[PDB]
Symmetry: C3
C-alpha cells in the first residue's frame, strides 16, 4: 500500500516502487449456451396487428441466427487466429465442431442449466445455459402459429417475447461488428451474477477468487468472448477468462526523459535518454518487463499485466536505477541532438526537461507559480504542486500520496566530449557508446 | 478561408497555409445527475403477466445499478488515472466522495432540475438532472408493489417504465465496456438539447459560444464522460468539455516525402527526408507542433487540436520551409538508402517520390493519364487531376480548391558526396550531417 | 489449399507459402435512402397515456434527425476527408448536395424501393430504400394528431411505431459517435439480405460475386458507411464496398527474428535482423508488400489486403529468402546489441531466439517438454508441439496443418568481425553494411 518514488538526477529518470503484481499466466475457457428452437418457415393466412408484431419480432430471431451463421463461416472460428491470445478458446471452439459434443453439453444442461462437462479433448469446461429461448418459443409461440389460422391472443405475449429475444439480438450485434471476438466481455455476453458465479466455481484457490471478485471490471477488460457454432438448437460461445499465476510480487515503473547539455542554441548540445521505460515486475527469479503501456492496468496499488506482451530480463536489470555504469548489466540508452523541452508525469511527481528559451514552471492552484525550472532535467513532487507547464503545454500532476526521494547526482551527459560523442544512436548502450568513443579516439 | 500550398522541390516537402486555429488549453467540468430510488427487495405473491413484465424490467434497473457500483470500485474513479486528460474531471469526481457534497447537489436540483453549485473545493460547477427516475418509480410503481398483493394495472405503465429506464440502461452499458470513461460523449450521456444548453451557460465569451455551438460534433469527439458515484439515491457522472483558449491564429501542415538521388539500381543512391511533419500553429509567441495526426481534427478551414500532445517550438522553425540550411534553426532530417516509390496526398495536391523502375502517373477521370512522373520527387496540384498511381497503389487527390505554388529549386541531395554521406541517420539534422562529413574528410 | 513453410537458419527468418490473394483495388458506391416525413410541431390539448407514449417516441424521431443534421454540418461530408479511403464515397456524397439529385433518387424509388440511378456526375449508382417511414407516419400517425384533439387508439400502433423507428435510431447513434463514418458496416446500416442483394446486382463478374458472398463478414469489415444529407424528406447515406481486382495470385508472409552471436554476457555479442516482415503478394508483374498486419485479413488460405497501405517492390525482392547476399536486390537488415530472448509464432511453427541465461523450451500438452532450445535462433514445426515458452512468456503454436522445411545454413552473423561491425543500424542493408566495414578497415 506504501507508494514511494526515487528520482535519479544523474540519469534523468525516476522509478515508482511499492506496487503489487497480478500477472496473467493462463486462461480459463467456459462455454456459454443459449437454447434455441429450429423452426419451419410458418406463415399465417391473415394479417392481424397482434400477429404482425410477432411476425416482425420473429424476423429478428431469424436474422440474428443467419448473421451468427455467417460469423461461424469466417475467422477466427476456422483456420486463422491460433497464434494469438484466443488460442485456448479456439481449441474448445474447434472441439464443439465434433459430434456429439453439442449433444454432450445439451444433455448436461436440461436439468440444471449450469454444469461442468468433460469434452473428448480432455478439458473440464464449465457450461452455462443463460437463456432457454426454445422452451419459451415452443410453449407459447409455436402452437399459436401451427393452426393454419393464428390466434388473436393478448399482446403481453409480444412484449414478453421481445424481452427474451433482446439479449440474443445484442450478442449477435456485438459479434457482427467485432468479427466474432469481443473484448471487454460485455454484460450481455456474461452478466455480473453469471460472471461472479463463474469465478466462484473455477479450479482456483480461495485467494484468487477474492482477487478476481474484487476486480470484476478488470477481469472483464482482460477477457475474450468467442463465437463458435449454431448446431442442433444450441448457440454456444466461449468466454476466455484470465488466470493470474503471479500475485503479490513487487513491481515498479521506470520513467525516463531526455538529458541534454545546457546551452542555449541555436547550437550543438548533445543528449542521451534511458530506454526500455515501462513496468517491471519480479517473476520466477527473473524480471518481467512490459514496454507497452496498454498491457498493464493499475488498480489501487496492484498492477494487472499480460505476460504475452512481456520480455524476460535478468534481475540485474534493476542496476540501471542505482548505477548506470555497472558491468553486470549493459544498460541501454539512445542519443540525439533534439534539445526540445518536455515533461513526464510520474506517479508521485513530474520530471521536467527544460532546454532552450522555453518557459517551464510548476504552479499551485491557489498560490500560483512556485517553481521555475532552469535549463536541464529536474523533478518536483506532487506535494503542494497541482500543474506543470512546459511552453504552451499544461500537465496535471497525479495527486496520489507517497513519499518522494530526490537522488542528487551529476548528469552523466557532462562526462562525454561532444566532439567525439555519437549523437544519433537509435538503440545503443553504455558499453556500446564508450567503445564507439575509443575507436574515434585513434 | 483562403487555402494555399507551397511545394519545395529542393527539400521534397510541402506546406498547406491558410488555416485557423482552435487549440484546447483548458477543461470545463459539469456534473450530470440521475435521480434514483432506493428500493427494498419487494416481492409479490402471485405471478401475473402484467406484473411479471414489471418484475423483469425492474431487474434491469437493479442490475444496472450493481454494474455501475462495480465501475465505482475500479479506476479511474479511485487512485490511478490522474496524470492523464481526465485529471480535471477526476478532481470533481473525488470531491463528490465527500459529504455532504451529494446532498448539496441534490438540494439544488429538486426545484429547477438544472443549477450551478459551489463545491467544498471551490469550483463553480453546473449540475444537471436529466432524469428523475425516483419521482416516477415512487409515484406509480412503489405503491402497487407495497400491497403484499400487487395490482393488475394497465400495461401502459410497463411501456412508460421501459422508456424512462432506457436511457439509464444505455449509460450503464457504455460505461461497463469503457472502464467508466467514454469518448466521444454519446447523445445518451448528454443530448443535443442538453449539450447546447450547457454551452450557452458556460463562463466563456460570446465568441467561444458560437464556435462550440457551430461545431457540436467536434466538441463531442473531444469531450469525456466519467462515472463517479451512486450515493444517496443520486447517480452522478462528470462530463469534461474542452475550452479553446487559442482561436484564429494561423496554422499550417507540413508534408514530407523521401528525396533520393536518381539512378536505377540495383545500386547505391543516397536519400534524405525532412522530419517532424504534422500540424504547426502559432501560440503565444512560439509555435505549437502536433506530430500525431490523431490529435488535430480539421473542420472547414479551422484546425481543432489538443495542446496536451504538442511540443513548443521557437518561431524560427518555419525557416526550414524557406531555407533548410539556415543557422538560426537546426532543421532535422533522416537518411536512408531505401529507394522505394511512394506518394503523399497533401491538401491541394500530391507529392510523388518515384524511384527505380516504378510506374508513377497522375490520371484524370475522363481524360486518362495526364502526367508521367520521372525519377525524383515531383508535385502536382489537384487542378484537373483526380487520381495518382504509384506502382500498384492508387491515391485519390483531395478536391478542395486552393491556389498552389511550385517553388523550383535544386534537390539538396545532389549537394552531398555519396562516398562520405551518412546513409542511416534515424533522427539527425543538417548541422549534424555536415559535421559528420567533416570528421570523415580527415 | 496447400500451406507450406520454409525456415532459413542462415537469416533467422521464415516464409509461409501457399496462400491466395484477394487485394482490394477499387471501391463501389451505393446510396441507401430512408423515406422520412417532414412534420409541423403539432401538439395535442390533452395528456393521454396512449398519446403520451407517441409523444415520447416521436421526440426520438425528432432528435435523431437533429443529430444527423449536426453530422451533416461536420466532416467528412464537407471539406476535409478527401485524401483518405472514403474519397469515392465523399464524391457521391457531394453530388447529392446538388439539385435535383435528391429528387432524382426519390422518384426512382417510389415504385420499386430499389433501383439504379445515373447522377449528374456520370456514375451509375445503385439506390436502396430500406425504410419507408414517411408512408407509415402519414397514414397512421399524422391524421390522429391533426384533429386538434387526438384519438385514444389502440396501443398496438405505439409498438408498431417503435419497431419502424428502431432502425433509424440505431443508425443515428452509430453515426453520432463515429463522426458520420462507421467501419465495419453494421447490420443496421445494411442487413444481410440487403448486402447480399447488393452484391448480386453489382457490375462484376460471376466469380467475384461468389467470392464476396462467401465472405460477407470480411466484406463488412472492409466497407465504409458515410452519412450525407437530410434533404426533402429523404435520408441518404453512402455504403462503400470493396472491389477485389487481384484474385488468386500467390501470397506469402515473411517472419523475422533477431540473429545474434552466441555468448553468455554480460558482454558484447552483435546482432542483425531482417526487416520488412509482413505479407507479400504478386501483383501485375511486381510484388505488393504490406508491412502493417492490420491491413491484411486471412480467411482460410486466402489473404484479403488493401492496396492503399502497400508498397510496390520488384519481383527480385523474393531473393532475400533464397540468398540474402544477392546483388540483384539490396536486402535490408537492422543491427543492435540487444541479446534479449523472444519467439515468433509463424503459420506452421515457431521461431525461437534464445540468448543469455533464458530458459526456452517447446512443450507438449500431455507429454511435457520435448525440445530445449540452445543459444541461437532455432525453429520447430507445429507437429506434436502445442506451446513454446521463452523465459516467463508462454506462446501457443498455430495448429493448422502444413508441411515444414528446415533450410540448414550457417548464421550470417558469424561472417562479420565484431570489432568492426556496426551494431546500431536502424534501417541498413547488406551492401550498406559491407561498405561501412570497408571504410573502417582503412
Ligand atoms: C508505510 O506506510 C505507513 C503508514 O501506515 C508509515 O507509517 C510507514 O512509515 C511507511 N513506510 C515507509 C514509507 O517506508
Ligand atoms: C483570397 O480569396 C479571394 C476570394 O474571394 C480572392 O479574391 C483572393 O485573390 C485570394 N487571395 C489570395 C489567394 O492571396
Ligand atoms: C498438396 O496437398 C495434397 C493433398 O491432397 C498432397 O497430396 C500433395 O502432396 C501436396 N503437395 C505438396 C505439399 O507439394
Amino acid at each position: 500500500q506504501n507508494i514511494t518514488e526515487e528520482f535519479y538526477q544523474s540519469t534523468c529518470s525516476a522509478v515508482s516502487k511499492g506496487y503489487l503484481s497480478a500477472l496473467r499466466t493462463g486462461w480459463y475457457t467456459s462455454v456459454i449456451t443459449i437454447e434455441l428452437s429450429n423452426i419451419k418457415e410458418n406463415k399465417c393466412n391473415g394479417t392481424d396487428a397482434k400477429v404482425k408484431l410477432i411476425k416482425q419480432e420473429l424476423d429478428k430471431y431469424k436474422n440474428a441466427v443467419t448473421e451468427l451463421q455467417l460469423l461461424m463461416q469466417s475467422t477466427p472460428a476456422t483456420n486463422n487466429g491460433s497464434g494469438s491470445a484466443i488460442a485456448s478458446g479456439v481449441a474448445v471452439c474447434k472441439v464443439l465442431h465434433l459430434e456429439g459434443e453439442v449433444n454432450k453439453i445439451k444433455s448436461a444442461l436440461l436439468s440444471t442449466n449450469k454444469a461442468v462437462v468433460s469434452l473428448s479433448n480432455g478439458v473440464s469446461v464449465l457450461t452455462f445455459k443463460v437463456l432457454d429461448l426454445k422452451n419459451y418459443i415452443d410453449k407459447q409461440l409455436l402452437p399459436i402459429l401451427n393452426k393454419q389460422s393464428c390466434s388473436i391472443s393478448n399482446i403481453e405475449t409480444v412484449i414478453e417475447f421481445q424481452q427474451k429475444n433482446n439479449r440474443l439480438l445484442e450478442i449477435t450485434r456485438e459479434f457482427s461488428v467485432n468479427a466474432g471476438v469481443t473484448t471487454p466481455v460485455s454484460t450481455y455476453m456474461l452478466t455480473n451474477s453469471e460472471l461472479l458465479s463463474l469465478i466462484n466455481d473455477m479450479p482456483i484457490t480461495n485467494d484468487q477468487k477474492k482477487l478476481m471478485s474484487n476486480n470484476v471490471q478488470i477481469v472483464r477488460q482482460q477477457s475474450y468472448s468467442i463465437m463458435c457454432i449454431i448446431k442442433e438448437e444450441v448457440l454456444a460461445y466461449v468466454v476466455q477468462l484470465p488466470l493470474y499465476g503471479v500475485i503479490d510480487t513487487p513491481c515498479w515503473k521506470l520513467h525516463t526523459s531526455p538529458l541534454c547539455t545546457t546551452n542555449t542554441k541555436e547550437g550543438s548540445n548533445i543528449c542521451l535518454t534511458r530506454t526500455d521505460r515501462g513496468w517491471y515486475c519480479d517473476n520466477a527469479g527473473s524480471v518481467s518487463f512490459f514496454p507497452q503501456a496498454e498491457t498493464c492496468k493499475v488498480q489501487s496499488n496492484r498492477v494487472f499485466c499480460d505476460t504475452m506482451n512481456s520480455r524476460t530480463l535478468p534481475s540485474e536489470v534493476n542496476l540501471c536505477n542505482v548505477d548506470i555504469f555497472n558491468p553486470k548489466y549493459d544498460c541501454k540508452i539512445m542519443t540525439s541532438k533534439t534539445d526540445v523541452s518536455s515533461s513526464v508525469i510520474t506517479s508521485l511527481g513530474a520530471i521536467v526537461s527544460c532546454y532552450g528559451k522555453t518557459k517551464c514552471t510548476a504552479s499551485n492552484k491557489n498560490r500560483g507559480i512556485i517553481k521555475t525550472f532552469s535549463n536541464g532535467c529536474d523533478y518536483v513532487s506532487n506535494k503542494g504542486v497541482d500543474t506543470v507547464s512546459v511552453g504552451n503545454t499544461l500537465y496535471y500532476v497525479n495527486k496520489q500520496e507517497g513519499k518522494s526521494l530526490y537522488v542528487k547526482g551529476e548528469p552523466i551527459i557532462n562526462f562525454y566530449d561532444p566532439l567525439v560523442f555519437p549523437s544519433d544512436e537509435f538503440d545503443a548502450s553504455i558499453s556500446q557508446v564508450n567503445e564507439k568513443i575509443n575507436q574515434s579516439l585513434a
